Design a protein around this ligand. Structure first.
Ligand code: HEM
Ligand code: HEM
Ligand SMILES: C[C@H](O)[C@H](O)[C@H]1CNc2nc(N)[nH]c(=O)c2N1
Ligand SMILES: C[C@H](O)[C@H](O)[C@H]1CNc2nc(N)[nH]c(=O)c2N1
Ligand SMILES: CSCCCC(=N)NCCC[C@H](N)C(=O)O
Ligand SMILES: CSCCCC(=N)NCCC[C@H](N)C(=O)O
Ligand SMILES: [Zn+2]
Lengths: 407, 411
C-alpha cells in the first residue's frame, strides 16, 4: 500500500504515497497488465467538485478555513440549481497546471508550474475561437523562444453545445492519398485532410502544407480558417556535416500544440483546450520522420549516406536514425527555436521525479511513453522504475469529433 | 472475455483468449500499473490441483485428454502425492514443461525458437561434482563450436526446501568484477558481489578485465563448491569494427554463450531451483547493456574519445553515435567468427511473426513490452508499435532470491 521504486543504475529508492490519493482506473488487473495499450449528473458532480476544492485549499495552505467551507457551500448551491458550476480564475489556473503535473506520459513536467493559462470561457463563436488560437500560437511561439501555454474554451453543458478543435494539433502538415498508391505528406492526417477538402479547403497538395483550423463552437458545425503564415514558425532541416541533407527538402514546425484532448477539472469537462510546449528532438527525428506510417525517410537518407542496406545487421537503419536526429537538433538550435534533446530532457525528468517524491509523495509516470524511442537504455529513465496511476485534474483522450458530431 | 491488441503501424488487431487461463498475479491493480517494476516448501493440499492442471494441459497437447492413459496418470500422481508428499515427472512431461516455461516467458523476445530446446535431465545428480559434469556437457553441447543450440539442464526438484540444488552464479559464464580501494571497478561491475564470494570460497582471482568466473555449485542443500570450467569449453569473441581499425585496441571481448542459471523453473507445482538454460545473444544485450550501461563496462566515453565526436554538448548525440558503432562491432565480430548472434531488427521482426502465429494457434502470447522493446532504436523496430498483454502462465520461469541470502551454512 506504500510503494517503493528503485533506480537500477544508481540504487536510489523512492517511496510512493501519492498513489493512494489515486482515483480513476488503469485498465490493468491482478490477472493482466495493460501497460502497453495506447487507449485502455448533479449527484456525481459534487464529490468531484469537493475533492478538487479540497486539494486547492490545501495547496494555498487554507484547508478547513472559513473561505474553504464558504466556497464548498457556494459550489454546492450552484450545482443544485444550475446543474453545473463555474471555476474561479485561481482554480482554473491551478486546475490546468495540475492536469499537466499529473500527465503520466509527459517527460517535460519539470516545467509544470510555468504555464500560461488563457481563459477563453467567454468565447461564443468559431471566429472567436480562431482569434484566441492565433493569440495563443503567437504568444507561445515568441519568435522562437517558446513558452508553454493552454487556452481553455467554455466547458461542456449538455454535450450538445460542445466546443472542439477538430485538428489533433494546432499546427500539422496535410496528407493526401495518391493515384500511384502511396501517400504525399503526413499519412497520419489523411482523414482529417479529406474532411477539410470536403468542407472546402483549397489544398495546395504539397508535402508540407500546413493544415487549416477546423473549429466548432457551442456544438455548431465546424468552420475552416487559415492560421496567418507569419504566425507559423518552421525550420528547414539541414545537417552540420552532410551538405547534401538540405536536398531531401525536409522542414518541420516549431510549435507542438496538442489540440484534441479533454481537460477535466473538479468534474467539469473542457473539451477544447489546446496546449503547447516545445519539442524533444526525437519526436520529430525518430517518430515523425522515421515511423513507417509517417514520413518514413530512413530508406532515402541511408541511400545518401552510402550505407550497406543489404542486411539488417549492418545497422544501417540505426546509423541513419542518429544523423537524422543530429540534424533536427542542429537546425532548431541554429535558428534559435527552443528544442530539447532526449538526454537532457530525461535527465530533467529524473530530477523532477525526485522533487515530486520529496514534496508530493510521488509522481505518476508511464515508462512506456517516458523512455525515448531511440537510445532507450542510455537515458537514465530506462533504468528507473515508475508507478503509473491516474490523478485528477487530468488530460484525457476523447473520441474524434466527426465520429460523434451531428451535422 | 476476449481482449484486443492493435499494432499501430500495420493496423493489425489480434484477439487474446489465452489470458483467461492465467492464475498467477501481475503486481498491478485497477488503481496502479507496476508494468515497469523489475521484481514485483508446498502442502500436499495445494499440490494436486497444480499437478492436475499441468497434466490436463500436457494430455491436451498430445491429443489424449480423458484417455485411460490420462486418467491413470492422474490417479498415479494423486497416490504418489498422498504417500510421499510430492511426485516425479515422467521424461516427456519434463520436456514439455521446460519448453512451455520458455513459451510462457513474457519477457523473452526469442520465443519463436521455443519448440527447439534440448532438455538435459539431471534429476539423478547428487553432488556438486556431478553438477559440474552436467554443466560442462551442457556448455559444450550448446556452444557446438559457434553454431549455438538452445538447451537447459534440470537438476533435482525442491523437496523440503532444506535440500535445494542451486547454481550460485547468475550465468554459467560471466566475467569477474573487482572493487578497488580507490572506488573504481575492474571487470564487470555487475558481478562484484558474486566475485567477492568466490574469492572468499578460495578462488585465486587473476584480477583482470575479462576473467571467466568459476562455477559455484550447491547440491542437496550442502555448502557450495568451486569449479573452473575448462577454458577450451569457453568460446569467446574478440571485438573489432569493420571500418575502425582502432576498435580492437580497446581490448574488448565477450563470451558466445549466454546461459542464465539463477532462475527457478516451476512445472506442475514442482520447483526446480537449479535449471540453467542457454540460447544465443541478440546483439544489443552486449553492445548496448553490457558495454554501455553506466553500471557495467561503461565504454561510451572511451569509444567517443577515439571517434573524435563533439563531447562538449549532449545534443551532438555523441552518445547515440558511439552506441551504434559499438553495436556494429559486436555483430561484425560474432558473424566473422561464425558464432551465432541475431541483430535487434531481425529478432524483433521474428517475434512479431511468432506472436501473430501464437494468437492464431493458442489464443494469445503474453508479452512484456518493457523488456521486449530493444534498449536502442526502439521505435524503428516493429515491437515498439505492437500492443501487448502481459500475464502469467505456468509452466514458468521465476525469480528466486540469491542463495547467499538464504543458505544455512554447514561449515
Ligand atoms: C514544455 C515542454 C514539453 C515537453 C518537452 C513535453 C514532452 C512530451 C513528450 C515527448 C510527450 C510524448 C508525446 C508523444 O510522443 O506524442 C508528451 C506527452 C504529453 N504531454 Fe508533454 N511536453 C511539454 C509540455 C507540455 C504541456 C505544456 C502540457 C499541458 C499543459 C503537456 C501535457 C502532455 C500530455 C497530456 C501528454 C500525453 C498526450 C498523449 O497521450 O498523446 N506537455 N510530452
Ligand atoms: C534462442 C535465442 C534466445 C534469444 C535471442 C533470447 C533473447 C532474450 C533477451 C534479449 C532477453 C532479455 C534479456 C535481458 O535483457 O537480460 C531474454 C529474456 C529471457 N529469456 Fe530468452 N532468449 C533466447 C532463448 C531463451 C531460452 C532457451 C530460454 C529458456 C529456455 C529463455 C528464457 C528467457 C527468460 C525466462 C527471460 C527473462 C529473464 C529475466 O527476467 O531476467 N530464452 N531472452
Ligand atoms: C503499443 C505502444 O503502447 C505504442 O507504440 C506507444 C509506445 N510508446 C510511445 N511513446 C510515446 N512517447 N509516444 C507514442 O506514441 C508511443 N506509442
Ligand atoms: C526499470 C526498468 O523496468 C528496468 O530498467 C528494465 C527495463 N527494460 C529492460 N529490458 C530488458 N530486456 N532487460 C532489462 O534488464 C530491462 N530493465
Ligand atoms: C503539446 S504536447 C506536449 C507539448 C510539446 C511536445 N513536445 N509534445 C507534443 C506531442 C507532439 C508530437 N509528438 C509531435 O511529434 O508532433
Ligand atoms: C539464457 S537466457 C536467454 C537465452 C539467451 C539470451 N539471449 N538471453 C540471456 C540474458 C543474457 C544477458 N542479457 C547478457 O547480456 O548476458
Ligand atoms: Zn499494468
Amino acid at each position: 500500500r506504500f510503494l517503493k521504486v528503485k533506480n537500477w543504475e544508481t540504487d536510489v529508492v523512492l517511496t510512493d504515497t501519492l498513489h493512494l490519493k489515486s482515483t480513476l482506473e488503469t485498465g490493468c488487473t491482478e490477472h493482466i497488465c495493460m501497460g502497453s495499450i495506447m487507449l485502455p449528473t448533479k449527484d456525481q458532480l459534487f464529490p468531484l467538485a469537493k475533492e478538487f476544492l479540497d486539494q486547492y485549499y490545501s495547496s494555498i495552505k487554507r484547508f478547513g478555513s472559513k473561505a474553504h467551507m464558504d466556497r464548498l457551500e457556494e459550489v454546492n448551491k450552484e450545482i443544485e440549481s444550475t446543474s453545473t458550476y463555474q471555476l474561479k480564475d485561481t482554480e482554473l489556473i491551478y486546475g490546468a497546471k495540475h492536469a499537466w503535473r499529473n500527465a503520466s506520459r509527459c517527460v517535460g513536467r519539470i516545467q509544470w508550474s510555468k504555464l500560461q493559462v488563457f481563459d477563453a470561457r467567454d468565447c461564443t463563436t468559431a471566429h472567436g475561437m480562431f482569434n484566441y488560437i492565433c493569440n495563443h500560437v503567437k504568444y507561445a511561439t515568441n519568435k522562437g523562444n517558446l513558452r508553454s501555454a493552454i487556452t481553455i474554451f467554455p466547458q461542456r453543458t449538455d454535450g450538445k453545445h460542445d466546443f472542439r478543435v477538430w485538428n489533433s494539433q494546432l499546427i500539422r502538415y496535410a496528407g493526401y492519398k495518391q493515384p500511384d498508391g502511396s501517400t504525399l505528406g503526413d499519412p497520419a492526417n489523411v482523414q482529417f485532410t479529406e474532411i477539410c477538402i470536403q468542407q472546402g479547403w483549397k489544398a495546395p497538395r504539397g508535402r508540407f502544407d500546413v493544415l487549416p483550423l477546423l473549429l466548432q463552437a457551442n456544438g455548431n458545425d465546424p468552420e475552416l480558417f487559415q492560421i496567418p503564415p507569419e504566425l507559423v514558425l518552421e525550420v528547414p532541416i539541414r545537417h552540420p556535416k552532410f551538405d547534401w541533407f538540405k536536398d531531401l527538402g525536409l522542414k518541420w514546425y516549431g510549435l507542438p500544440a496538442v489540440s484534441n484532448m479533454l481537460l477535466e477539472i473538479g468534474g467539469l469537462e473542457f473539451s477544447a483546450c489546446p496546449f503547447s510546449g516545445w519539442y524533444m528532438g526525437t519526436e520529430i527525428g525518430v517518430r515523425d520522420y522515421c515511423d513507417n506510417s509517417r514520413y518514413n525517410i530512413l530508406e532515402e537518407v541511408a541511400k545518401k549516406m552510402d550505407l550497406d542496406m543489404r542486411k539488417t545487421s549492418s545497422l544501417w537503419k540505426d546509423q541513419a536514425l542518429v544523423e537524422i536526429n543530429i540534424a533536427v537538433l542542429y537546425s532548431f538550435q541554429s535558428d534559435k527555436v527552443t528544442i530539447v534533446d532526449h538526454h537532457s530532457a530525461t535527465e530533467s525528468f529524473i530530477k523532477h521525479m525526485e522533487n515530486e517524491y520529496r514534496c508530493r509523495g510521488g509522481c505518476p509516470a508511464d515508462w512506456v511513453w517516458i523512455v525515448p524511442p531511440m537510445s532507450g537504455s542510455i537515458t537514465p529513465v530506462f533504468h528507473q522504475e515508475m508507478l503509473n496511476y491516474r490523478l485528477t485534474p487530468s488530460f484525457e483522450y476523447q473520441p474524434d469529433p466527426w465520429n460523434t458530431h451531428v451535422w
